[PDB]
Design a protein around this ligand. Structure first.
Ligand SMILES: [Mg+2]
Length: 736
């Protein structure tokens, strides 16, 4: 029994190694400490100082450099006793200060223990190296075990959720959030892995469920500067079960796919995996039928300078992808078509618009153009017209307009983006019919999306994501405001103002004003931003109009202020595509293409704007969550460099500050963070009472009784005692 076998990998890899002695005595030392900053500029930095003097209301401790210093007892970051270094739940700590929190996580991570609980959260820190804790053998261990009965692990949370589902007959959720490269997607896959094993029917459906992923990963993931396999879309996966607890189906909901990546990537980044998969792995035959060449031959793939990922065979991955397409069930038919779309996109990208005779766009070469048409199975002359000579309504008048180079290009870009996003939608719908169950009994849904985004530049997509995050954070706080209550002040009240600033109807918030502006064809970024400032500058406490910038505005989010830039918002909100282009493509010969333009469910939004659609999909998701028993996983990146063995304090604390763990902590820290079992308190603290005593509670008053700790510091409740913050350490800080 791996859990009892101190030699198993379970022990090696998931527990703090245990010695031969369990005695309270080894742990002794008289030397107290505090966490201080040897330089206050940079506050996430701390060193341990041995407190050598105590004023009546402050301490005076000894720097690592030997110099003594003074401190207020109330500003003191007390270091928990060493016995606590490495505990499995931060809730077990006496001193719940941030450095204290950072220290426990670091001590663990130093042992390659990447998972740790903090109350209701599972904290997961990317090790940036492979740890073999996801084997079937590791799966097996988690089966039916309580949270408290096994080491922290994604497997654990998953079991607890599945058991809760069976036991309470209630749907569940796991919300997996954090920065890019934190391991959200990785962990998401382990949840499904685990579920598939503990509950699959020893299989077709399960294989399909599993193969859908790689499918969506090829089309929605890409190499970026923070992650070789970045998810450029958010997702909510519903794992469906029958009443007996068996997997009966699945559904995927996708959000905010980064369509622009198809047309542009920053230096070092790559376009979506698939482009490269197609090009590297296509038979030397399709290459031709598709008019393929190499990546360098394509504007959409030859700009970033990076066309490869180390440790990655685009060719092999392509094998993998088509393989998944087969399992799920896409006909070879379907598959050439997908491939063609892809090919087409690439061609559309190579079309060069020139300066003809005056001011209007022309096409000297038609090569790329016909390559494009060919593959899509559209009429090249139509396309051509549709691209440079779109007919535009101007009254009762329908007039062709000759676009200049630029405009033509952008329009071109719009087509590619529509093609891409639509195809993605279609992929998702298709997968769903195969997987999805009408008649499901229960479900476990997993949300894999980013946490708050504060980048160098924040645009419309950032506001969207941050908006979702305000809602999830308030959902958390609201949840915690119940869980905490039912031991045996609702802070979510707190996010309302920001939320309203974004989504409010009357008075209107940012999105409503954006929608309003969107009706006017001649509106501009300036008109827009000016409208925003008119309604909210010095008028809404969560808004800030900048001192000098004329194109940005600030929103005070849960995680702090985020400055956004307004450019292109109107256009992003409308996500326009010339009608002629729709017409052209409404006629494709190709069977798939036609669905993309012919199916209102794919080809359109309602027509609502992009904002209105985001808001509504967010509200549905939240409604879904609202009916589940939720579980929270906070994935942390250890540094910004993708390196193992480098847990950067500032990097870490920041995330803890923004993803709500620190708030969670400091909340309960105002109450009774510790609430130990009676028997449990007695066994290590007996040292009137001996270890395994049966009048537990009594044995528990007893110890507090000898030591005669202050009563308001502790509280007698059935089964457990609670200890206000710091009580434990001092209790722990006392002679035998
Ligand atoms: Mg991901």
């Amino acid at each position: 029994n791996p859990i009892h076998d101190r030699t198993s990998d379970y022990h090696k890899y998931l527990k703090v190694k245990q010695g031969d002695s369990d005695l309270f005595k080894l742990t002794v030392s008289d030397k107290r400490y505090i966490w201080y900053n040897p330089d206050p500029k940079e506050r996430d930095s701390y060193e341990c100082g041995e407190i050598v003097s105590e004023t009546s209301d402050s301490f005076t401790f000894k720097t690592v450099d030997g110099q003594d210093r003074q401190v207020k007892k109330d500003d003191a970051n007390q270091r928990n006793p060493i016995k606590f270094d490495g505990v499995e739940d931060m809730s077990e700590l006496s001193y719940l200060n941030e450095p204290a929190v950072f220290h426990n996580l670091r001590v663990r991570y130093n042992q390659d223990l990447i998972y740790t609980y903090s109350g209701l959260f599972l904290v997961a820190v990317n090790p940036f190296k492979r740890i073999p804790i996801y084997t079937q053998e590791m799966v097996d261990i988690f089966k039916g075990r309580r949270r408290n009965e096994v080491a922290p692990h994604i497997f654990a949370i998953s079991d607890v959720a599945y058991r809760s589902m069976l036991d309470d007959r209630q749907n569940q959720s796991l919300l997996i959030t954090g920065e890019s490269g934190a391991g959200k997607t990785e962990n998401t896959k382990k949840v499904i892995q685990y579920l598939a094993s503990v509950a699959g029917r020893n299989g077709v459906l399960e294989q399909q469920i599993l193969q859908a992923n790689p499918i969506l990963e090829a089309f929605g993931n890409a190499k970026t500067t923070r992650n070789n396999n970045s998810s450029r879309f958010g997702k909510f996966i519903e794992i469906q079960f029958n009443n007996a607890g068996f997997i009966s189906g699945a559904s995927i909901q996708s959000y905010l796919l980064e369509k622009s990546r198809v047309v542009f990537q920053s230096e070092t980044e790559r376009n979506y995996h698939i482009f490269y998969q197609l090009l590297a792995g296509a038979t030397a035959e399709e290459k031709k039928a598709l008019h393929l060449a190499g990546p360098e031959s394509f504007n959409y793939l030859n700009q970033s300078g990076c066309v490869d990922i180390k440790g990655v065979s685009d060719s092999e991955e392509f094998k993998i992808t088509r393989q998944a397409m087969d399992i799920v069930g896409f006909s070879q038919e379907e598959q050439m078509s997908i491939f063609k779309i892809i090919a087409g996109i690439l061609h559309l990208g190579n079309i060069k618009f020139e300066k003809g005779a005056g001011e209007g766009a022309v096409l000297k070469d038609k090569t790329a153009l016909n390559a494009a048409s060919t593959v899509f199975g559209v009429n090249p002359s139509v396309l051509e017209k549709a691209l440079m000579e779109p007919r535009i309504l101007a009254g009762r008048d329908l007039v062709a307009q000759h676009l200049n180079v630029e405009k033509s290009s952008s329009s071109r870009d719009a087509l590619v983006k529509a093609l891409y996003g639509r195809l993605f939608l279609w992929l998702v719908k298709k997968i769903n019919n195969v997987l999805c169950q009408e008649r499901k009994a229960y479900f476990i849904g997993v949300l894999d999306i980013s946490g708050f985004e504060i980048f160098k530049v924040n645009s419309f997509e950032q506001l969207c994501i941050n908006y979702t995050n305000e809602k999830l954070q308030q959902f958390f706080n609201h949840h915690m405001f119940k869980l905490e209550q039912e031991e045996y002040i609702d802070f979510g009240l707190d996010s309302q103002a920001t939320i309203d600033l974004i989504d409010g109807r009357q008075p209107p918030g940012i999105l409503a004003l954006l929608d309003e502006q969107s009706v006017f064809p001649n509106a501009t970024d300036n008109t827009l931003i000016t409208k925003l400032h008119s309604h909210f500058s010095k008028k809404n406490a969560k808004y800030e109009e900048p001192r000098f910038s004329k194109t940005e505005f600030g929103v005070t989010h849960y995680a702090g202020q985020v400055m956004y830039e307004i450019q292109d918002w109107l256009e992003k909100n409308k996500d326009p595509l010339q009608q002629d282009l729709e017409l052209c493509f409404k006629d494709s010969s190709d069977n798939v293409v036609t669905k993309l333009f012919n199916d209102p469910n794919i080809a359109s939004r309602a027509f609502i704007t992009v904002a209105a659609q985001y808001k509504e999909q967010l509200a549905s998701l939240m409604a879904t969550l609202e009916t589940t028993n939720p579980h929270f996983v906070r994935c942390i990146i250890p540094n910004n460099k993708q390196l193992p063995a480098k847990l950067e304090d500032k990097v870490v604390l920041d995330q803890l500050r923004c993803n709500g763990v620190l708030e969670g902590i400091r909340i309960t820290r105002k109450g009774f963070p510790n609430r130990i079992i009676y028997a449990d308190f007695v066994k290590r603290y007996y040292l009137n009472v001996p270890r395994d005593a049966e009048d537990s509670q009594k044995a528990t008053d007893a110890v507090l009784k000898h030591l005669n700790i202050d009563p308001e510091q502790y509280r007698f409740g059935i089964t457990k005692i609670f200890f206000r913050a710091g009580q434990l350490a001092r209790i722990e800080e006392a002679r035998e």
